[PDB]
Structures are given as C-alpha cells and as structure tokens.
Symmetry: C4
Subunit: 386 residues, 4 copies
C-alpha cells in the first residue's frame, strides 16, 4: 500500500495518552540505552520509537556525558513504542548524530547524518539499503529534523539546515522517493532560522513547525506541496511556543526577538486560522508541558486562547517534543490523526549526574473526552554510577 496522504487533520478536542516507556526508571537496573530524541513514526502496520544513542547503557561508565554530541559512536536505533530502549529489543538503523525517519507505506526511509562538522554526510536508507547520500553544502554542521519526515503519495519530505545556529543559515526542503532525492530547494528566507523541524502531511501537502535558534521565541513554519512550492512564516500567536521565551503578550508574523536566541525542538498543528501549540510550562527552563488551543493563533497576534491541557507539571523536567501522524491506512479513519511525543530529560545540566538521557510519553488527538494530568519521568536521581 502507498500512503496517499490526501486526507485532512481529524477534528479533535484534546489529547489522550498513547504511550509511556519509563525507560530511565527501568534502566536503573535493566540494560537500557542512554538516549536522546525518542521520536515516534508509524507505518500502515505499526508505530516505532526512533532514538539516538551514544552506544552506552544507563548506570555504566560509558554514559559519562563529556562525550561530544556529534560523536562517531552515535547511532540511530528503533524499538517498539512504549518499551524501554534496550540492546535486546532495538533494531539498528544508521550511524548518526542527527536523524529522521518515516514510512511511505512500502518501506522505512531513514536518514542518518554522521562525519565531521565541516563535511557531514547524510546517509539515506530505504528498507535498510543505502540509496543516497547528501553532503554538507555549507560545511557547518549539516543537520535535520530529529523527528519523523512526512510522506505523501509515494514521496517523503524533510528539511535540512547547514550553517550557523546563532545567525542566518541555509535551509533545504528535500523530496525523497524510495530513498533517492528527486528534488531539493533552498528556501529564500532572509531573517528566518529553521532547525529541528516537526513536519506532518495534511491534505496532500506538508506543514513543518520548527525552531528558531537565532532570534525568534515564536516558532517558524514552512509549508509546501508535492513539487516543493512553498510558503514561510512565523506563528502569530502571542502564546509563544519556544523555550526560552518571554511571557505571553503581543505576537508577530515574523520572529519575536525577545529571548529569541537558543530554543527547543517543538511542534504545532494548524487548523485553518487556529493552532494547537505544545510547549514547556516554564519560560526559562525545560520544565513542564502543556497543550494550548488558540482558535485564531495561526494568523492573529493576541495572547488569548481557549483551551489548555496539562501534560507535565512545571515542577518536572520535560524536553524535546515532536509531531507524528497516524494515516488512514493504519487507523481506518477518513482523516489524518495528529499525535505528539515529549522527551523527558534527566541528568545534566540540571541535575548532579555524570550522564544525560530522556524517557518519553506520547499522546494522540481525539474528539472525545480527555483530561490533563502530569505524566513525568519518575526516576530517582542520582544513580549508583554517580
């Protein structure tokens, strides 16, 4: 089957909890990878958690976090959703310190970037066979989504960035068919900054909501059709989505400069003029998580919103978050179902350990009754290795 991707996002009123892996609690005794960015991606048959590991287990000396993030040991692996990421249940995908994956209905596409900062190379695999490579074109840390790419009608789409993370860089949309790049376009986006995009298919097109690490505390977006004809902007809501960020106030259709430097991987779902925003509860640290429905937040700059659903209390650590979808071929629904995952980061720099890892929770949007709560990581730090 080919995922057609022609349906629209399902109407939803809230988010129902889908998974929680308790990876760090389990890794206190079991053999569990130290991981980051545990993104979920689904096929027409199953959902999988992808993640990056340094090839080290929790509570082992090799978890010592003084290793660089872009190291030669870092690999992309995947395990079933909701399971602790272990060498005994994880499939190897690619050598990678930056990554993406998605399924077009016939096979898994994985994208793994490795190599040195001045000449990194993305290796594209389709069903685990190398099908293409993309080399850094600006020689300054080629990097990609750290969540699932989006597939429409037999083609898959991703965003890659090359250049500074504290200034103007270069952004490319890629169209990939059976793992071969068939088209690429560099965005003409002066004064924009795109990193770590969350992209989802919707009505035959793709929407990506990303991270401005240069000078925006609201999130940039880019949407495009199957030929990579594109539009760009920033989410206008004064419910600002990045972290760090200022207190909610008047937004902008351009980058909001106050507290704009630095950031966090996040996501949002557009519903016409409205937007569902996932964000941390703290404005200054990666703490808490909440879903906010702003019925005019895509296009209007006020800070008013209609619904807030709690996900993680502000007293608990959160982390990266990303979108994923479940297509009709998987669900049997007539619409595209939006979902998201949250990474719950424990360890350095906020806690007195030698290591850093995340566990994950995930939710799916439903048009039935839901409830806010807090589903935090739950591990008791420090560990015995510390």
């Amino acid at each position: 089957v080919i995922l057609t991707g022609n349906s629209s996002l399902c109407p939803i009123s809230g988010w129902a909890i889908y998974s929680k892996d308790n990876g760090i609690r389990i890794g206190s005794k079991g053999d569990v990878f130290v991981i980051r960015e545990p993104f979920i991606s689904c096929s027409h048959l199953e959902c999988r958690t992808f993640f990056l590991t340094q090839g080290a287990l929790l509570n082992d000396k090799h978890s010592n976090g003084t290793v660089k993030d872009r190291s030669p040991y870092r690999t992309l692996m995947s395990c079933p959703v909701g399971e602790a990421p272990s060498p005994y249940n994880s499939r190897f995908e690619s050598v990678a310190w930056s990554a993406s994956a998605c399924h077009d209905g016939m096979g898994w596409l994985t994208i793994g970037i490795s190599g040195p900062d001045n000449g990194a190379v993305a290796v594209l695999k389709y069903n685990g066979i190398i099908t293409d490579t993309i080399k850094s074109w600006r020689n300054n840390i080629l990097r990609t989504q750290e969540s699932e790419c989006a597939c429409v009608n037999g083609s898959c789409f991703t965003i890659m960035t090359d250049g500074p993370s504290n200034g103007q860089a270069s952004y490319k949309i890629l169209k990939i068919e059976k793992g071969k790049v068939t088209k690429s376009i560099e965005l003409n986006a002066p004064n924009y900054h795109y990193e770590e995009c969350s992209c989802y298919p919707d009505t035959g097109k793709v929407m990506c909501v990303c991270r401005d690490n240069w000078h925006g505390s609201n999130r940039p977006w880019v949407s495009f059709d199957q030929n990579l004809d594109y539009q760009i902007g920033y989410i206008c809501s004064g419910v600002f989505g990045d972290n760090p960020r200022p207190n909610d106030g008047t937004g902008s259709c351009g980058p909001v400069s106050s507290n704009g430097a630095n950031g966090i991987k996040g996501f949002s779902f557009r519903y016409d003029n409205g937007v569902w925003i996932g964000r941390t509860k703290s404005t200054s640290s990666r703490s808490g998580f909440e879903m906010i429905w702003d019925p005019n937040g895509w296009t209007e700059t006020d800070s008013s919103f209609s619904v807030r659903q709690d996900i993680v209390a502000i007293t608990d650590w959160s982390g990266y978050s990303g979108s994923f979808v479940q297509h009709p071929e998987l669900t049997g629904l007539d619409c595209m179902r939006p979902c998201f995952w949250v990474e719950l980061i424990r360890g350095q720099p906020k806690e007195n350990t030698i290591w850093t890892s995340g566990s994950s929770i995930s939710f799916c949007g439903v048009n039935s009754d839901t409830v806010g709560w807090s589903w935090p990581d739950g591990a008791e730090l420090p560990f015995s290795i510390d």
Copy 2:
C-alpha cells in the same frame, strides 16, 4: 474470523495446571518487572499474560512500595503466558492504573484508565490504535475489571465502576465494537457493590462475578445479553467466596454483611444451579487457594459441597484471581472452555520488604483426571534491595 461466543461451558471434573511463570524467583537475578494482576486473555491463535507495572524492576530501588497505586508511571503490558515479565519480552499496551483486555477474533481490545482520581479517563485501543475514550462520570476513581473482558459475536463487554469503594457506587455495562463504545447501561442495583469483575461468555450472553468491597463477603454477579438486558444477584452458597469472609455457614442471595468490607478480586463459574468457586483457603489473609464444586451453590444457601481441589497450600501466599476462557476457534472443541489464573503476592504488607509483586499460575477445566497439589510462588524473601 469473529468469535461467535454461542457455545456453552464445557463439562469438567477438575482443573489441570496450564502455566507457571516463576516471575519472582527469576527476578532475584534477571531483569523482571515488579507486577500486579497478571490476567490471561486469549485470541483464536495464542494466549497472553497482561499485567500492570510501575515501570520498575525487582531488586531495584524504584520498586520501593511507597509509590501510590494510581500513579502516572503505571502501564499495562503483556507477555507470553508462562514467561517472566521482563522489559525484554513484554509488549507495551497502554498507560493504565486500571485495565482490561480481550480479543474479538480480529483484534485486541485494550482498556487502560489513567489520570486523576476526580477525572480519570479510559483509553480504548483496537489493534493498538486509540479508538475511544470514556471519562469518569462520578469523579471518584473510574476503574474496571483487572481481567479479560468478554467477546460475543463481534462485540466485547466490560464493567466499569465510579464512586466509593466503601459505599454505594455506580456501575455501568459497556458494549464495545472494534474499540468503539456502542452502548452503555447503568445498573439499577441499590445496596449492591461491584468491583474488579471477572466476566466470561456463555451461550451468547456474558456472566460477570465480581467483588463487593462495601458489605458483602459473598460475590455479586451480573449477567446480560448483547442488548445489555441484565440480571443481578449474589452467589447464594454458604461456601463464601470473598476474602476476608466468615467461616462457612448459611449464605444469602444478597450481600453477606459479616466480614463484608474489603475483599479480593476473584471469580466463579455457573453451571445451571451449581457453581465452581475459586477462593483463598484462609478466611482472614490472602493465603492458599482451592476450587470448590457446589452443585446447588448458585441458588441455595447451604454450606455443603461435593468436590474440593487444592491449588495453593494455606501456608503460602496467594492473591487476586480471575477467569479466562478458550473459545472453540482456538481449541477446536465445540464448547467454551473455562480457565482461571491466580496471582501469588509476595512482599508488603505481609513480608518485610520494600516492594510488592506477584507471580502467576493458571489452570484449565477438563473432563479428565486431575489432582490437587500446591504450586506456590517459591521465592526466598527478602531480596538484597531490602
């Protein structure tokens, strides 16, 4: 295939041992979840053990019992019958501190309740995809069976409770089709109390035998057809089924008030006016287990019975128990086979440990020779974490 569920319970004379997982003995060294309620549920192809875990392993500090039962860490998992429940052999099912699951012949239905005490939400999944939610309607600990639901002719049925565990609460029957609630009915049951129901199909209808936590030391039951027309009662036998309970004597068709408060999840199988009762051997603690055949015990209040089969000796810990069936589509028989599982609880509050866990045994009803014995947990407590 659709499980028709139109056949009657097989004639049986005793219980043959089906599985034993040795989970706690193995968890002394291996990586084994701390678990509760390991109920079994079967498809037309296989049987699985479902269980709730806090995401903690035996002999690890996170197994510390001080965590509340309704925590955000609690998840429903499943593994093959008879295997130690490990993070390396277990499937994730749902985030849940109360749960149910069953198979209709075409897919697994799982029901997992999480969220706060005043607004819990049951997430319904079919083949692992969220298909519906049910929110608390009394705002007082929505909770369900902790054993398998019952499927007949393409619909699956379960019982949910909301309200006090020491007084009158509210009880609903649900009819579920492919994970969607298609009908629900509130029982009109003043002075009844229903919790932790064990439900099985029989001749196109469902029978549930439950736990009266309020004021009954015999077990209440409810049976209903596919339109949710229902009957309610209490098992009349003077062989009382709950724990705690009084000494055997004259029973009642209503709740037996002596020692009626508190209780334990249990089960029974009705055969016309007779009943097979599974119960602890002790009247005051969760110790021992036995199967009693009382040929007039469903409807008559005397305490005489015909057959007793030992399952666990009175000197050994037992725990929760539940029914499961094997349908003709799985066994090739022309009747519905009754089976049951027993949880063997070790640790708190009876033993000097920081943790509480169960292991499991299970038995199938057969019309051939059987024997009583004792198949206890067998772990040597305390563990080194203690």
Copy 3:
C-alpha cells in the same frame, strides 16, 4: 504436512557436531536458567532444545540444590538449538518435573507431569492447548522419557513408567493423535525395567532404548508398530551401555545384573544386527562420552566392536543423552537421519557448589568424514554464588 515416518535410518559412518550451547559458561554472567535434560526435538521446519528448569538462574540464591527434583516450581521450556537457555529467549511449554515433546508435522505435542508422588498427572498439550491428561495408575511417581517422543503418520508414541525405581514397575506405551490418547498398552515385561526411554521412528514403527534402574547394566529396548504390537529385549552386546556398568565382557539378551542397579538416561540406534551405542567413558561415574559401532551388537553377546568415536574426554563431566531424528520432510533426504544430544552436568554431587546444571552438545549421523575430539562444558567452577 504430516510426517509420514515410513523411511529407514540413513546409512552413516560417524557423527558430525551439530550444536553446542555453552550454557553454563554464558550463565556465569548472563541470565541463564539452571536446567536439566536438554533434549532436542525437530519439526518439519526447525529444531528446538527442550529442558526442565526449577525457575532459577545460575549464580543466584534460588539455584540452591536443596529443592527436590519433583518440585512445584519445575517447568518445561524450549529455546532454539545452540542458544543458552534464558528467560529472554525461551518459550514456556508446561509445568513439569518429567516431560516429553515431539512434532507430528502439524503441531507440537508436549507432555508435562506434575503433582504429588502418589498421584501425578501428565498434562498433554497440542499447539499449547491442553488436550488430555493421564493420571498415575500405580501412585508411585508417574514419569516419562525426558527426550523426544516419536511420530509416525499422524500419531505420536511415548513410554510412561509408574512404580518402583529399584524393583519391578509398570510400563505403558501411549498412542497420541493431536494430543489425545487414542490407545495404550501395558507391557508384559516381568524382570524388565524401563525408564527414561529414547524413542525414534524407523520404517513405520518405533524403537525405544531405555534405562534399567533395577538390575541391568545393559540397556532394555521396546519396539512397536502403529497398533502397539510390541517386542521387548535387552541389547546383547558385551559393550555395556549403562552407567554404572562392569568392564566390557560377555553380554546378555536379558538384564546384566553386575553393577545393574541405578543408571543413566541413554540411547542406541539399531542397524539390523548391529548397534550404535552412546555411553560414558567411565564405568563408575558420569564422565566422558563415546559412540561405538558394534556390527553384531544388537543380537550377539561378544565384547568386540568396530568403530569408536570420542565425544567428551573421560576427564570431563558428561550426563544424560538421548536420541532425536530429522525427518525427510525437514532434510529433503529419502531416509531418517539419526542424531543425539548429550547433557554435560556441572555442580553437585561431584563438584563443590550449591547448584547443579547442564549444558548440551549434539551430533548428527553422516555418511562422510568425521573426527573424534572432546567437546566439554568448559565452565570454571565454583561460581561466585558458591
């Protein structure tokens, strides 16, 4: 696919090594069951190692030997051939302190005996579903092969013993179809003793070579056709097959009384008037292993033989051994291939540990070049738990 079982044993000249699991060496660190009798059985698709475990892991306190052999914790498990038997790679089969298993071409039959000594019950499963039970008929430790049963033309056959292990007992052949006992016969075998039979199919019939624990240091045998017409005798060769045994000398077609009490599970393959004998190298302890070809040893009493192939040196521990076959439906050959497994027992009573376990090696008969060697267990005892 039904295994016809109508072919004869392949002509062979020696034994080629098939598998070695290194179970005890691996279990010094990994999570590995303490096991006994690791017998192999094959289907038309795969070969599996079955084994009995006490539900305890090597190097853990629950491996403490003081538990009796016939305990309620003992279970039959299986894993792929050549893998260390772990809770993470093993399938649960049955609760059992004595067992057998085989595949008829369409499904696995397992036989598991549990319960008390005076009333044990064999539980029969077909495809993991209970299909029959057999209760002790002499109330004195019902017991069976501890190796694979034999299947011919849709029926499987096994031997069960009930009664004394130091005197005359009672022996039954069972005919089983889809897990249901369809016929049984009690052997008329005064002065014979049958235990722990190794049975293989050959030309539409079954041949079993067993253990005389009463008063024979040669091995008894029983052969029968699909109607359970049977013949009985003892292997005549002065190359005595049991352990303990006298030095090789003049054999007997009846039980050889010298060193006759006690014994060890073993096997032999009949080729007309000749026999392949597997035995320990020591006459007094379970040390070493060798295959001997005696071209007239089935029917003649001399102690001369033609070929000896070393398997385990006399300076290394051996243990139980049993036959298995690979049918033409598995191999594509036009004959029945004979194979055997050997258990290498470490620990009590010969070594200063708290535990006893076995690892396994296996060999297949081939008509090409082979070599003798020693393939011992290789663990360094004692372990840290000792």
Copy 4:
C-alpha cells in the same frame, strides 16, 4: 529466488558508513559476547553479522584469553547488523573455530570447522541442516575465509587452506550447491600463500583477495569461473596492503618479501587495472584504517594513487577486514554493490586486559558524496574484570 551473480561491480567514488555496533561499549554493562571476526553476509532480504565466540561474555572470568583460539567452545553465531552480539539476540550457526557463510538466494550456507589440529572437519549446513563434511587433507589446521563466501547462479564458492602458516601450504577452491560439495580443485600455486580470503562475485566469476602469512606484504589473489578454472597473482601496487608491511615503494606482481611474514585479514576490489585497497594506516601495528583508490594498482608497481578516504584514525585500534556484496536482488540496482566491514580489536596483546574482543563498523560503496572521518571502537579500557 536464485542470485544470478552475472552483474559487474557498481562504479563508486567513495564509501558511506553502513553500520556500527558499539559492542564493547555496550558490553561494559550489558550481556555481550567476546567475539572475533564479525563478518557481514547478505541474502536477497537481509544482512547479518556472523562472528566467532568462545562462549564467554565481556566482563566475566570466562573471557580470560588464556583459552587457545582453536578450542572446543568456539562457535559461529549471527545477529542483525549493527546490534551488539548478545546471547539474547544471536542465533547459533555452527560449532567452529574457523568459519564462512553466504546465501545463494534460497538458503544460508554455513561452514564451521572444528576438531583437532591434525584432523579438523568442516561441517557444511544448508538452512541449518548438516549437508556435507570436509576433513583436513594435510592434517595441519584446516581453515577457511572468516568472511562471506561468494554465490553465483545457484553455486557458492569458498577457499580452504591446509598446511603451514609460515611456509608453502595447500589451497583448494570448493564449489558448493545446496550445501553439498560438487567440485573442488587444488591450486597449483608454488611460492604463493593463501589464508583468510575475502571473496566476492563479479560478472559470473569470483575474485578472492587474501593474506600471505609466509612472505608477502602485498596481498595474493585468485579468481575463477563456475567450473573452477582459475588465475592467480599478487596485487602489484606499491601501496602495500598487508600488515605488517614496508613503507610504500615499488610493488611486485609476486609476493613482496620485505616485512612479508605474518599479516592480517584484508580485502580489495578490482576495477579493470585499478584497485580499491582497504588497509591499516600503521605499517607495524593494527592501527587505523583507510580506503585507497589506485587507478593502475592491480597491474602496475608504482606507489602512486589517486584517492584516500580515512575510516579509522592511526591513533585507534583496527583489525581484520573483509568484503561483502549486496546483490541486485537485494538492492534493486543493476550492478553488484561492493561493501566492507572492519573489526576494531580491543584488549590483548596491546592493552592491559585479560581478554580480547572486537566491535565492528561497515561501509558500502556509492557513486555519490562521502567523507573521511574516524569511527573508532570507543570503549574505555580496562574493564572491572581486569
């Protein structure tokens, strides 16, 4: 599916990283085999890592390297590519201290050599069933490739050696069909030395590049067609391929005598008159790894070359390396894709441990952009067992 093997090697410009297993880093805490020679072999559906283990885990006393290399404990296993080789994810293949494996499109062939030095026996398996044996014909350590065999048109091909490793030995090509040897030829190769061959299919023929342990610091080669008509030579490039070796200088069509004794398993790919050479960076120790393209290096003796791609830095340990291919039936390409693996050896003799093991990296040849880097093992030695 029969792999035709009639295509030629794909044109390539560099090497893209395919896998990294981090086995030793993970095995610091996880249950991971001590391994050597982790060679990769692919079917039409998947790629697997084969390896030899002594049946011991990292960080356990049985990893003590005083056990000889040709021991009875040594076994050939396989696991998915990129996963740490563990007893929980590895399938058993054969008892072997020297081994080879490949897939003909319909099934796995494995060759495992065991037994004594003066009479070793290769056991050939097809789909895990013993199909043939080959006994030592010179009684002096029969040994084979330690990498994948080459399959063309329903036949698989391998090289075996018997005789001295410091003098003239005897070399045989084998043609194997469904695991049965159908033809063999002894090379007429006076003054040549062939060990540990890396063989690949190319245009209906097989090319093997090997290790001269006697007196060559360049590598010998043998190529042959499906009838085992063959040609022999040595790689002429003054870019010497063995380790140890002299500094780059004038090559030879025969064995280069300077530093010729001893060696390391390696590989090369012929492209007309040019050659891609994989070699260590150090001339004196097993350190570093690089790929060199020499456009006239197959047939000319100068030390000039065109392209160097770094794989492992000279300050990090490397080890054995070998070729593998991905056939068009797996990739969908119209050519034969060349790939290679590198073993990263840690421990004795270079480091102060009791053990020796390898982890692995692998690369595939592509005609797109690539980059040099260093992907070393990354474990911190010594371990706590030391």
